[PDB]
């Protein structure tokens, strides 16, 4: 059985315009482990993105954290794009600073 990933995009610290921060895309509850996560800024890929090592939960479903440095502004739009065998097309989740 294959399980589709849950996706949360958020900042490490409360976002303040002009203050350096970290943009996170946390994917969890998916199976199998092969997955692609991209961070997006104003409609294009953010090049340098790192991720945590592969681990899994009690139900054996994997989880990963993708993160990069960023500085939020009032007009810059951020998002995350996730691709998995359970998805017919890559799914995009936008970043809401209040979520």
């Amino acid at each position, epitope marked *: 059985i294959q399980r589709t990933p849950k996706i949360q995009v958020y900042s490490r610290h409360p976002a303040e315009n002009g203050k350096s921060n970290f943009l996170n895309c946390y994917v969890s509850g998916f199976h199998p482990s092969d997955i692609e996560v991209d961070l997006l800024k*104003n*409609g*294009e890929r953010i090049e340098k993105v790192e991720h945590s090592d592969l681990s899994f939960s009690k139900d054996w479903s994997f989880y990963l954290l993708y993160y990069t440095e960023f500085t939020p502004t009032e007009k810059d739009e951020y998002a995350c794009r996730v691709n998995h065998v359970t998805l017919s097309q890559p799914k995009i989740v*936008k970043w809401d600073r209040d979520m």
Partner: nanobody
Amino acid sequence: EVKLVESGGGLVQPGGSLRLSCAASGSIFSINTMGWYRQTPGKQRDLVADISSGGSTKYGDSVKGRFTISRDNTKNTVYLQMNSLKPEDTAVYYCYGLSYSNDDYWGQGTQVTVSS
């Protein structure tokens, strides 16, 4: 909002070349990244190549060195030059685009078959 019109798919021999194109109609100039994904039945769609309005490109590992993407921002058209085609390149090639607000758009896809 944005409509993507693709062309150029079809049958080609192993070791041959093929040139795909994709133009954006409508609310164009609101599209940043454009590119191609490919998909076989039952599986997900994998990245082939894309390019931003600034020219930043990314290629899938299996197509790096054989495919080349180019772009004309004045008419919002991207071109995919596929060289040294292999039977594993057989798939449906979907054009896509991202607005500057990270809204994604897709075309209907074009079939590419590499067979003897």
